[PDB]
Amino acid sequence: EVFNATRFASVYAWNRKRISNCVADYSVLYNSASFSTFKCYGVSPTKL
Amino acid sequence: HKNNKSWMESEFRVYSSANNCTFEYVSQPFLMDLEGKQGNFKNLREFVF
C-alpha cells in the first residue's frame, strides 16, 4: 500500500507509515526490477 | 439507530485526542453477548493482567 500506492504524497507534507507486528520480507523489494535507485546506510539489503 | 434498525456505538467519549500511535490490533470479541432481558444461572468472567 506504500510502494504500490494509488495516490501520491507531496514532499513538504511527506507521509510516514509505521510498520510493526507483521512479517517483513525485504527480498520482495530488490527482487522487483522497478527501482532505479537502491542505496542503504548502516545495513545491507542481502542480510535484511 | 432507527434508520438501520439496530443498536450502534460511535460516541467514544473516553478520550479527546490521539497522537503518537505505537500499536494497533483488532480481533474477535471474547466472552460477550447482547441482550437487555433478565437471566438465571449464568456465568462469571475472570481476567488477570
Query: Resolution limit in angstroms?
Result: 3.9
Closest-CA residue of A relative to B20 is A18
- State the structure-solving technique: cryo-EM
Give yes or no for a contact between B23 and A21, defined as CB atoms under 8 angstroms apart. Answer: yes
Residue B3 is given by DSSP the state: T
Do the beta carbons of residue B31 and residue B45 sit within 8 Å? yes
Neighbours of A29 (CB within 10 A): 13
Residue A10 CA to residue A3 CA, distance in Å, equals 15
CA distances from A3 to A9, A34, B24 (A): 12, 11, 21
Cβ–Cβ contact B20 with A under 8 A: no
Identify all chain B residues contacting A21, using CB atoms and an 8 Å cutoff.
Answer: 23, 25
CA–CA gap between residue B37 and residue A37 (Å, rounded): 64
Q: How does DSSP classify residue A20?
A: -
Kindly give the residue spans of alpha helices, DSSP state H, lying in chain A.
Answer: 27-31
Q: Which residues of chain A does B21 touch, with a Cβ-Cβ cutoff of 8 Å?
A: 18
A20: Cβ contacts below 8 Å, ≥ 6 apart? B22, B23
The cell for A14 is 511527506
CA distances to B28, B30, B32, B33 from B43, in Å: 20, 14, 11, 12
